[PDB]
Amino acid sequence: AHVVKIYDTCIGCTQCVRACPLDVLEMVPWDGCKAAQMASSPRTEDCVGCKRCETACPTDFLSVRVYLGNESTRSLGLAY
Amino acid sequence: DVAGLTPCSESKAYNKLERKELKTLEKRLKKYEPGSAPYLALQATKERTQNRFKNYAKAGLLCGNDGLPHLISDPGLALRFNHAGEVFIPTFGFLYVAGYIGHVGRQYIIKSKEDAKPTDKEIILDVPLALQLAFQGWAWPLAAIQELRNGSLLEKDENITVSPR
Amino acid sequence: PWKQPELDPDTPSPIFGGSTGGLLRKAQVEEFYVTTWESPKEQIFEMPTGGAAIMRKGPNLLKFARKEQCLALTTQLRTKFKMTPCFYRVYADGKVEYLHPKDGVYPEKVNAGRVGVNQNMRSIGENVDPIKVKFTGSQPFTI
Amino acid sequence: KKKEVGPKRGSLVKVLRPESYWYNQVGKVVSVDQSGIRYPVVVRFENQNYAGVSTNNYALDEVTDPP
Amino acid sequence: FVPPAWAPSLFVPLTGLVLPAIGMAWAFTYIQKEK
Amino acid sequence: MKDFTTYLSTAPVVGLGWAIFTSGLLIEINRFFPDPLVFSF
Amino acid sequence: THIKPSAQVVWPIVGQEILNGDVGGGFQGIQITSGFFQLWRASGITSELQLYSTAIGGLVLAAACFFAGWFHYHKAAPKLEWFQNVESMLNHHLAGLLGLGSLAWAG
Amino acid sequence: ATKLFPKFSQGLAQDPSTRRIWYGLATAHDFESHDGMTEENLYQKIFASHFGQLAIIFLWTSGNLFHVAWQGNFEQWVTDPIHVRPIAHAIWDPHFGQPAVEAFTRGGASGPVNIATSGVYQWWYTIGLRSNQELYVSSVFLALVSAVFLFAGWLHLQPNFQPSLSWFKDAESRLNHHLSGLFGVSSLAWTGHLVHVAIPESRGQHVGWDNFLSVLPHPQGLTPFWSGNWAAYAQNPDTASHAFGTADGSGTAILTFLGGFHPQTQSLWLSDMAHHHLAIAVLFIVAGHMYRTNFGIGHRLEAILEAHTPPAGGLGAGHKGLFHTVNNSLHFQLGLALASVGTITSLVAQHMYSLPPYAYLAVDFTTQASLYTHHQYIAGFIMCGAFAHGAIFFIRDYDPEQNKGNVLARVLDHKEAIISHLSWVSLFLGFHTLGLYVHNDVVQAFGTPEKQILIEPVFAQWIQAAQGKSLYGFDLLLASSSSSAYSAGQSLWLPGWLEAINNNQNSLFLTIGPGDFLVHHAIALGLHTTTLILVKGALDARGSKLMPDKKDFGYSFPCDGPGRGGTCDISAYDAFYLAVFWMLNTIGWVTFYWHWKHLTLWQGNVSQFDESSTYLMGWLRDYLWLNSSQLINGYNPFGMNSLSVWAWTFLFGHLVYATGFMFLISWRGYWQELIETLVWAHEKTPLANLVYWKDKPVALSIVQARLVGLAHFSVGYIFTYAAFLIASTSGRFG
Numbered sequence A: 001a002h003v004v005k006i007y008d009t010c011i012g013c014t015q016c017v018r019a020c021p022l023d024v025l026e027m028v029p030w031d032g033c034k035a036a037q038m039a040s041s042p043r044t045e046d047c048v049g050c051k052r053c054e055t056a057c058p059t060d061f062l063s064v065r066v067y068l069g070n071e072s073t074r075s076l077g078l079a080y
Numbered sequence B: 001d002v003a004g005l006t007p008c009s010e011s012k013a014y015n016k017l018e019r020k021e022l023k024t025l026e027k028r029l030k031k032y033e034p035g036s037a038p039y040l041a042l043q044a045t046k047e048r049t050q051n052r053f054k055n056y057a058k059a060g061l062l063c064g065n066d067g068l069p070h071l072i073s074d075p076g077l078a079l080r081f082n083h084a085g086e087v088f089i090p091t092f093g094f095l096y097v098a099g100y101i102g103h104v105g106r107q108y109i110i111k112s113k114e115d116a117k118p119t120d121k122e123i124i125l126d127v128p129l130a131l132q133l134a135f136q137g138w139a140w141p142l143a144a145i146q147e148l149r150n151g152s153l154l155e156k157d158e159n160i161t162v163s164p165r
Numbered sequence C: 001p002w003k004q005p006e007l008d009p010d011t012p013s014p015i016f017g018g019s020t021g022g023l024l025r026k027a028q029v030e031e032f033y034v035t036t037w038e039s040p041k042e043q044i045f046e047m048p049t050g051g052a053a054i055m056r057k058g059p060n061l062l063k064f065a066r067k068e069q070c071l072a073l074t075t076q077l078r079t080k081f082k083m084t085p086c087f088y089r090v091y092a093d094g095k096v097e098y099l100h101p102k103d104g105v106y107p108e109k110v111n112a113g114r115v116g117v118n119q120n121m122r123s124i125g126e127n128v129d130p131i132k133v134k135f136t137g138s139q140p141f142t143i
Numbered sequence D: 001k002k003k004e005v006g007p008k009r010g011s012l013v014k015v016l017r018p019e020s021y022w023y024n025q026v027g028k029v030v031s032v033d034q035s036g037i038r039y040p041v042v043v044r045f046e047n048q049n050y051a052g053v054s055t056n057n058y059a060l061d062e063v064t065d066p067p
Numbered sequence E: 001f002v003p004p005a006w007a008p009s010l011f012v013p014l015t016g017l018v019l020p021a022i023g024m025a026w027a028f029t030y031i032q033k034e035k
Numbered sequence F: 001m002k003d004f005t006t007y008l009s010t011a012p013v014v015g016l017g018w019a020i021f022t023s024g025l026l027i028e029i030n031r032f033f034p035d036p037l038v039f040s041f
Numbered sequence G: 001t002h003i004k005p006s007a008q009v010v011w012p013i014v015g016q017e018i019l020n021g022d023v024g025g026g027f028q029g030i031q032i033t034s035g036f037f038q039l040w041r042a043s044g045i046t047s048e049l050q051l052y053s054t055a056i057g058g059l060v061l062a063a064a065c066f067f068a069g070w071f072h073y074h075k076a077a078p079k080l081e082w083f084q085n086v087e088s089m090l091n092h093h094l095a096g097l098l099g100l101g102s103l104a105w106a107g
Numbered sequence H: 001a002t003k004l005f006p007k008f009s010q011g012l013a014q015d016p017s018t019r020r021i022w023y024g025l026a027t028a029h030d031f032e033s034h035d036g037m038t039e040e041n042l043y044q045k046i047f048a049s050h051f052g053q054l055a056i057i058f059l060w061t062s063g064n065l066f067h068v069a070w071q072g073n074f075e076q077w078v079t080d081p082i083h084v085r086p087i088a089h090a091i092w093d094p095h096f097g098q099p100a101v102e103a104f105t106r107g108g109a110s111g112p113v114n115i116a117t118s119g120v121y122q123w124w125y126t127i128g129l130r131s132n133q134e135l136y137v138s139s140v141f142l143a144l145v146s147a148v149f150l151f152a153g154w155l156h157l158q159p160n161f162q163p164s165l166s167w168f169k170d171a172e173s174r175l176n177h178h179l180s181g182l183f184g185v186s187s188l189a190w191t192g193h194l195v196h197v198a199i200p201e202s203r204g205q206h207v208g209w210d211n212f213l214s215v216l217p218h219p220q221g222l223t224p225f226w227s228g229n230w231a232a233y234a235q236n237p238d239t240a241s242h243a244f245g246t247a248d249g250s251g252t253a254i255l256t257f258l259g260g261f262h263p264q265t266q267s268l269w270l271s272d273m274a275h276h277h278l279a280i281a282v283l284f285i286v287a288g289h290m291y292r293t294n295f296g297i298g299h300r301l302e303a304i305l306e307a308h309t310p311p312a313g314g315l316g317a318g319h320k321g322l323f324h325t326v327n328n329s330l331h332f333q334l335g336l337a338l339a340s341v342g343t344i345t346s347l348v349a350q351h352m353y354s355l356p357p358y359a360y361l362a363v364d365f366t367t368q369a370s371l372y373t374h375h376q377y378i379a380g381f382i383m384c385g386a387f388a389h390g391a392i393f394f395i396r397d398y399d400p401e402q403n404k405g406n407v408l409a410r411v412l413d414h415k416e417a418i419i420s421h422l423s424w425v426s427l428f429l430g431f432h433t434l435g436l437y438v439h440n441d442v443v444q445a446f447g448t449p450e451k452q453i454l455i456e457p458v459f460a461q462w463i464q465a466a467q468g469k470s471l472y473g474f475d476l477l478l479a480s481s482s483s484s485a486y487s488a489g490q491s492l493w494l495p496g497w498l499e500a501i502n503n504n505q506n507s508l509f510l511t512i513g514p515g516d517f518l519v520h521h522a523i524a525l526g527l528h529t530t531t532l533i534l535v536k537g538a539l540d541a542r543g544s545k546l547m548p549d550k551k552d553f554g555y556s557f558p559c560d561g562p563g564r565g566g567t568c569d570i571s572a573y574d575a576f577y578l579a580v581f582w583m584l585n586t587i588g589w590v591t592f593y594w595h596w597k598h599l600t601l602w603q604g605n606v607s608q609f610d611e612s613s614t615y616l617m618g619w620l621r622d623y624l625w626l627n628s629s630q631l632i633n634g635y636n637p638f639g640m641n642s643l644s645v646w647a648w649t650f651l652f653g654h655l656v657y658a659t660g661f662m663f664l665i666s667w668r669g670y671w672q673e674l675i676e677t678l679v680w681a682h683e684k685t686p687l688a689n690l691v692y693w694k695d696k697p698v699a700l701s702i703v704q705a706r707l708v709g710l711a712h713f714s715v716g717y718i719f720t721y722a723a724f725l726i727a728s729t730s731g732r733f734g
């Protein structure tokens, strides 16, 4: 499926997870940010690449990136 | 007599076009009584056409094989055949006016940035300030080249927003 | 959460007529998703696959063909009535997978029990150029 | 600890981050975190980006004086 | 050397009907070829 | 007055004023100098 | 049947006076296709004085409606229950907006 | 899942959708993105593909020769090259009706035939082919050559025959061999064939393989060549009253400098072209042994690249590091090759019509128009391909650490300045050209056309007066005998060239007026705008402010979503796909100008083009409406003339244009939802749900949608203009 990569510039604001319509991201404990939270993608096989997480990222550039490629039944959003 | 072309006064197709225009204006005029407003309107149109055809002649304008006047754009060639007033003088005048516009816009951009919310001044114009900068732009090239001399016209490449490579 | 709940097919479905955007042949060929919630009272909600339904006072079970529909229903129930539902995925052979509350605390929380995966530890824009990774099968963002 | 890990709060800074929207731009320091995070320098910018935000976190090595 | 007069009556239907039909048949079997 | 003046100080209103001013200037120039093409004093 | 309907006249400025064609009747203008001439002939309008009076009445009613909008928003704003009386709105529109206007035009 | 059709992509194999087919075709020959691909395997696949394309080209020209020989009138056209039209191929369509069969019988044929417009008849008459048996043996020999090339590609693909990586990367030896052998001795053999065959065949002497090694091309017999008296070859040139098919007014000359055109056939002399190709061959051979091979002499590419750096930091590091950049990145070489070849075919198009090299080619108006239009469209297409593959080079294989401070790093550093200046010049040209055209149209509309602005193109007229055209007057070079340019070559090529350039019948330096000036500025606007789009796509290919990480997303990706205000059409592929539209508009402009000017020249009403190209009403009415009367009357309820097929393919092109509008305007969400509804309809129906699809039907990708819309748009454009051009030039001429 698609590739979801999260960098260290994330501030743990949990906006990307709330904007996710397929429950791909998660919040794990961290020490590199003030909020002590870091975004993770343990369910990247269910991500369709809608880039809704990138819209909700408040940091400049993007702390979360979605790269398309190798579309599957789950990645193409097919009910059939 | 440049570019194998004849002057408009010496040309025959120019006079033929003028005669055809006068003929169709007279044909339109003959359908109205002399004591009617369309008659005076068509007479004024014919007078304007005759004045324009007289002014296009005896002014250096030349036409080739169709009676439609041609314009010479190369400086020097237009200078030695009295064709500078065709495009050479108007292009300098347009450059003067365009520099006026650019200098006035630059002055308004710079002078409305050292204040709180410059976008508010951009969207709601300071009309007395705009008119003052409008009437102060008559010496735009002097101020432009002086800003070039002191270096305030151009910004250095360190304070300029730049795209990643 | 502490113990992963097991789905019950005998739980009553919410009061609804017939759906046209319901489960297709993929439900009997590939996996299909099933959402469960616990309604304290009967009320009308809007399904993502059609019109409106009425949930029963008790357990409620619904079936969908896409996980996005399940999460849309979940977030609608959480925003409108604070229901906290949960959906499973059932394959063709009957394998049941727990999907939304992986630690039972929802992904908005942390719970100090999830290991962060697929996290690049370098800043964005510090990735190598595609010329550096050529004829290797490794993307610049996958390292 | 000693002095401060970052610049003075409220002072103008120039962002040296190339991938940022505010590269070679002047911003105002809001607060500098002292716990030891990667990007403690919070900078507020007068002009918003395409996303509409105007604040970002930068590290110590990507801020300089306004020239 | 010179082709016979019935060559337009044979090659044109061959490359207009038969050859594209067998090409689409081969391509359809190649698209849906599974392991 | 000053609220109405700031409304008149908005960009569309001053743009409209410039539009009427420039259009009227060019139209009166064309009317009192009928159809010129070459600058001949 | 011989004079084309014309109601727009241009100003002779840059040679656009040629758009004032010979529509007939000793007039120069643009041949209009709105059919306003036939509408005014169907309404019994004969002289230009009636058209002037209709124009002045239209301007007066336009100013009255513009003041009415200002009044019914800023001064006397109807409530939500006033707008929700759909039965009264339908009755007044069927009887007064359409039927009374139809009877007045018939008369 | 995991079907075997995309064997070059394991990820595409595991795609249960119809898109797997489509992405299995568009990514077919992108070997750099294939799984488990090495550089040596990529080079071997490239070599096999090149041999395949060569075999296809040779098979195609063999088929052209065979279909001209069989079901053609080559001998009848040889006898009378003025009246009877060439025949391309016979028509066997059972859907044809009897009036359609009767109407298509032209050129003295026994069946329905197509009038040839490719111009191979004139070319094969010029090179010396006269009989149908010669065309037959040439076609079968080219078919054998194509089969040999296909077998060679297969054998070089086979193991223990694949070339090494250093064999492909040996740039110096390849450059020397292709400069000296592919261009030098090829041109030498071609001009030897010219001297041996074409000049005797143009002088009424048959030279064949049977009588080869027996007839001497020059009566002196090669002894002036060894004696150094090369001027003896240019002793008795062909006279003005010389017949091309016969020996009347012939001569004994194989290499000369008779600049101009043959008066009988309005084409360049065969001896002049033979001398040209001989000089070209000598220049290529003497420059084909300059680079450093395994011998001790030669030139190293990297040494000259690194040494050519301006002092005092004019270009920073200079041209250093470009050798590895060219050698490692194949897309850079692809872009350079496509740009050079596009400039070459642009020059070919601009030099065929003014200087026809083939006998009886200028009289064939439809042939010249079709050839010019085809060459210009191909030129624009590979111009755009050069720029697109340059953007591909910038995205895929470009290491700034390698070429740091060089010319590439510098032009990537100030790319904003280049893009801004190109945008400014595009805005300037477009604003002033549209303002001038609208001003002229308004002035002509008001009944007083003398008020329009007609800026005389004095620069081109001054150039043409400096090159021999005395129509404009003036006293520059090649018009006054006191000039050194007139004195030099006064008895070499000037008397013929001046006669050719002072004639108004041919297309050699035609009269240029204010309408020509305006359309030339429109052409300049089109070229500068397409250049702006393509260099903005190439320079911002690997990154921008909206997408700094554009290199990680590849060359052809749809968007980044609706975030940051919207990011659709941000890849360099989208910039190329917009530049395809702009290139199509520009080539449409140049072809409209060429077609209208040449049509008014052939009709003799050059004044109509002079007084009608100024304003766009003249372009719409006197060109797109007046000349389309015969095209639209190809088929009607009254009957049918010979231009029925051209009207049908004109409407066909307008239809494909509309389908391009379909695939370009509407985007993916509506069609995806509609496909979902159709999937439900097929799933929930009796007597039809027994069947099923092996792959799930999905809507086409956004990049795929752009490609399909571009293809339909370009196909409709090409077919429409080809139909209009051929129907207008052939319906009233011959």
Ligand code: CLA
Pocket (backbone or CB within 6 Å): H307, H308, H309, H310, H311, H313, H314, H315
């Ligand atoms: C007699 C004095 C003299 C002069 C006139 C020059 C001049 C030049 N030398 Mg040089 N040279 C000199 C002495 C001189 N040199 C000496 C003493 C040495 C030591 C032996 C050299 C060694 C040397 C080397 C080794 C090389 C040069 C090169 C060059 C050229 C490029 C210089 C440069 O940096 O680009 C000029 C500076 C720039 C910053 C470039 C800006 C270019 C702009 C951006 C392009 C604008 C294009 C624009 C769109 C055009 C619009 C027109 C429109 C119609 C399209 C330039 C023509 C180079 C060369 O051959 O190039 C031709 C080169 O490789 N020189």
Ligand code: CLA
Pocket (backbone or CB within 6 Å): H423, H424, H426, H427, H428, H429, H430, H431, H434, H525, H529, H532, H533, H578, H579, H581, H582
């Ligand atoms: C024939 C139709 C047409 C026209 C006129 C334009 C015009 C333009 N496009 Mg193009 N374009 C078109 C179709 C067209 N496009 C199509 C179908 C495509 C494929 C999708 C593109 C793809 C494309 C690209 C990829 C690019 C352009 C660019 C441009 C600009 C070129 C600069 C120029 O020539 O000076 C301007 C000339 C003009 C004719 C513009 C029209 C201005 C006139 C004078 C009207 C101005 C207003 C006027 C005073 C009236 C005011 C009142 C009114 C508003 C109510 C210009 C805005 C380039 C650009 O943005 O420039 C940097 C660019 O990069 N276009």
Ligand code: CLA
Pocket (backbone or CB within 6 Å): B101, B102, B103, B104, B105, B106, B108, B125, B130, B133, B134, H420, H421, H423, H424, H427
């Ligand atoms: C007065 C302000 C101002 C100034 C000084 C400039 C200056 C420049 N622009 Mg910019 N531009 C402006 C406004 C301005 N622009 C606006 C409002 C727009 C949006 C329509 C643009 C759109 C624009 C484009 C798309 C491009 C430029 C380019 C350029 C450069 C070429 C010069 C030129 O004439 O381009 C031509 C500029 C125009 C045609 C824009 C004219 C817009 C209106 C007509 C002028 C507005 C005047 C303003 C109301 C004055 C305010 C005074 C105040 C007291 C109220 C130059 C750096 C070009 C570039 O990059 O060159 C390197 C280029 O490609 N500009």
Ligand code: CLA
Pocket (backbone or CB within 6 Å): G065, G082, G083, G085, G086, G088, G089, G092, G093, G095, G096, G097
């Ligand atoms: C029989 C009485 C009557 C009449 C004739 C009208 C007439 C009209 N109503 Mg109204 N309405 C009425 C009763 C009436 N209403 C009642 C009782 C209610 C409350 C239930 C409403 C609620 C209502 C709403 C919510 C809306 C209307 C609107 C409209 C206009 C519809 C647009 C149209 O057809 O243009 C026809 C235009 C003309 C014939 C031009 C002349 C219009 C004159 C000035 C109106 C004279 C009639 C007036 C009602 C007399 C009383 C007002 C008096 C105090 C001065 C029209 C003017 C719409 C509107 O706002 O339009 C402005 C609208 O959205 N009506």
Ligand code: CLA
Pocket (backbone or CB within 6 Å): G103, G104, G106, G107
């Ligand atoms: C809305 C449409 C309309 C209007 C305005 C009229 C109006 C008129 N028609 Mg017509 N008519 C109509 C429809 C209409 N009709 C229809 C549909 C038909 C069916 C075919 C006819 C058939 C018809 C015929 C056959 C005839 C008329 C006639 C008349 C006139 C007689 C009026 C009369 O006695 O009525 C009754 C009028 C009143 C009771 C007056 C109203 C009460 C007043 C206004 C009270 C004022 C009080 C006030 C406070 C005090 C003054 C204030 C001051 C001090 C400031 C009148 C001009 C007749 C005519 O022209 O001869 C004269 C005639 O022969 N009409």
Ligand code: CLA
Pocket (backbone or CB within 6 Å): H025, H026, H027, H028, H029, H030, H031, H334, H338, H381, H382, H384, H385, H386, H388, H389, H392, H555, H556, H573, H576, H711, H715
């Ligand atoms: C010397 C010539 C040459 C060579 C060797 C290449 C080679 C390559 N290019 Mg390049 N290219 C060229 C010319 C060339 N191109 C030209 C002239 C253009 C401009 C049109 C382009 C534009 C271009 C783009 C924009 C892209 C490439 C890409 C590619 C790669 C994919 C090829 C492949 O295996 O897929 C095989 C591909 C296909 C089979 C698709 C062809 C479909 C065509 C358009 C259909 C024909 C149109 C029409 C329907 C025909 C019927 C007409 C009708 C009337 C009957 C490959 C490296 C791609 C790449 O590198 O991937 C990132 C890429 O993105 N090229």
Ligand SMILES: CC1=C(/C=C/C(C)=C/C=C/C(C)=C\C=C\C=C(C)\C=C\C=C(C)\C=C\C2=C(C)CCCC2(C)C)C(C)(C)CCC1
Pocket (backbone or CB within 6 Å): B073, B074, B075, B087, B088, B091, B099, B102, B103, B106, B144, B153
């Ligand atoms: C004489 C003449 C001519 C010619 C011309 C020429 C040849 C020119 C050139 C030119 C050039 C070669 C130029 C260059 C430039 C460069 C640069 C670099 C620039 C810059 C600029 C600027 C910077 C500006 C600015 C401004 C603005 C925009 C605004 C404000 C003001 C000012 C002015 C400051 C012709 C025939 C056409 C026409 C007639 C006349």
Ligand code: SF4
Pocket (backbone or CB within 6 Å): A006, A009, A010, A011, A012, A013, A014, A015, A016, A017, A038, A039, A053, A056, A057, A058, A059, A063, A064
């Ligand atoms: S939206 Fe961005 S900054 Fe916020 S938690 Fe997600 S990756 Fe981090």
Ligand code: SF4
Pocket (backbone or CB within 6 Å): A004, A016, A019, A020, A021, A022, A023, A024, A025, A046, A047, A048, A049, A050, A051, A052, A053, A054, A066
């Ligand atoms: S692209 Fe969409 S589905 Fe994928 S991680 Fe982002 S928000 Fe979630």
Ligand code: SF4
Pocket (backbone or CB within 6 Å): H558, H559, H560, H561, H562, H566, H567, H568, H569, H667, H702
């Ligand atoms: S290409 Fe489509 S999905 Fe992408 S940003 Fe544009 S409209 Fe949105």
